[PDB]
Amino acid sequence: QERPTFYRQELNKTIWEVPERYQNLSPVGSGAYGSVCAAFDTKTGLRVAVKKLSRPFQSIIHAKRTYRELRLLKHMKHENVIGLLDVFTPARSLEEFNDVYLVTHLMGADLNNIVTDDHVQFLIYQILRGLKYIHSADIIHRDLKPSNLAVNEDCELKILDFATRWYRAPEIMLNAMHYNQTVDIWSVGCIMAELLTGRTLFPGTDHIDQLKLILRLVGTPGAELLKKISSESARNYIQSLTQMPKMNFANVFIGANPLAVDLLEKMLVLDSDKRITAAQALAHAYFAQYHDPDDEPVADPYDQSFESRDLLIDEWKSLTYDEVISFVPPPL
Numbered sequence: 001q002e003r004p005t006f007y008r009q010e011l012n013k014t015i016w017e018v019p020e021r022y023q024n025l026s027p028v029g030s031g032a033y034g035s036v037c038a039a040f041d042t043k044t045g046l047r048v049a050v051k052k053l054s055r056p057f058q059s060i061i062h063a064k065r066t067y068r069e070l071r072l073l074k075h076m077k078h079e080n081v082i083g084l085l086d087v088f089t090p091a092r093s094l095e096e097f098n099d100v101y102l103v104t105h106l107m108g109a110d111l112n113n114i115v116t117d118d119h120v121q122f123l124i125y126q127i128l129r130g131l132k133y134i135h136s137a138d139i140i141h142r143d144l145k146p147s148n149l150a151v152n153e154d155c156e157l158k159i160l161d162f163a164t165r166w167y168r169a170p171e172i173m174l175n176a177m178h179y180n181q182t183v184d185i186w187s188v189g190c191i192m193a194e195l196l197t198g199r200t201l202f203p204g205t206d207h208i209d210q211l212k213l214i215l216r217l218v219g220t221p222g223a224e225l226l227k228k229i230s231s232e233s234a235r236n237y238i239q240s241l242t243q244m245p246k247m248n249f250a251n252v253f254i255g256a257n258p259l260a261v262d263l264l265e266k267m268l269v270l271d272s273d274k275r276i277t278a279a280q281a282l283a284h285a286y287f288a289q290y291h292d293p294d295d296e297p298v299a300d301p302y303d304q305s306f307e308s309r310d311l312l313i314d315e316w317k318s319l320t321y322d323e324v325i326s327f328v329p330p331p332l
Helices: 060-075 117-136 183-197 207-218 223-229 232-239 258-267 278-282 313-326
Strands: 006-011 014-019 022-029 034-041 046-053 086-088 101-105 149-151 157-159
Touching: 006 022, 014 022, 014 034, 014 046, 022 046, 034 101, 060 086, 060 101, 060 313, 086 313, 117 157, 117 183, 117 278, 183 258, 183 278, 223 232, 258 278
Parallel strands: none
Antiparallel strands: 006 014, 022 034, 034 046, 046 101, 086 101, 149 157
């Protein structure tokens, strides 16, 4: 399996050493984690995003995050989830391996590019279709929000990026000892509401304002419920506040589709063992025009045993190098 021909260039004081297939690299972004160039991929005809990781192996914590990110991106093979087009390194061996470049579809426009009930059915459907997939591999997104959702001109949607707290599940904000995949359904619920109404559902000015906004809608959780969704400290905090009744949704969402309101009632609940799952949500009558049980696929199993392991920098690096070397590009 021959090494492509590489060429070097310096753009905005960054070195990019890339296979010749990637042309007309144009700087598009920078950040603590890497720099990004938009490029033309001459092999596939696609416009791509090439990300050059920034100091991928500088600490243990960095080397592990690099590995995690590559393992995740390599796993995702779904229409509604960002996948990995390519990963490469100019290194010819593990000994010279210092730099990692990740290539994905070039996205540009996120959910907030909204410049209509049927569009919201389609958009929310796609998010849930991707989450069904992600959750089936026992992966939790944990911070889903409009900025992490790319949408093209045909309203076709992808989940990215596995910092606002407006969409975060209460059991995360309250630091519960345990939580499940349905934290992501809370977030979808907040996203759906905003698409239906055109306003942020819980626009808290800070953490405590956010909590109080939430309680005002859903009502104060009873003893057994609060205990399971909160840290010991947060449990005592909530116990100190005045109790709130549950509001009737659709006094809140006046004029939204009644099925939409019904689905929201099932997503925006504090009890994460009662909160509707991605799979169950896809079969809700709100998505009757979109739902197809034989076109909502699930994921291969994803091995996260590395997450419990404390390894040295060189071990994280070597595992990462193994995954670069073993990568097999998607059909295209």
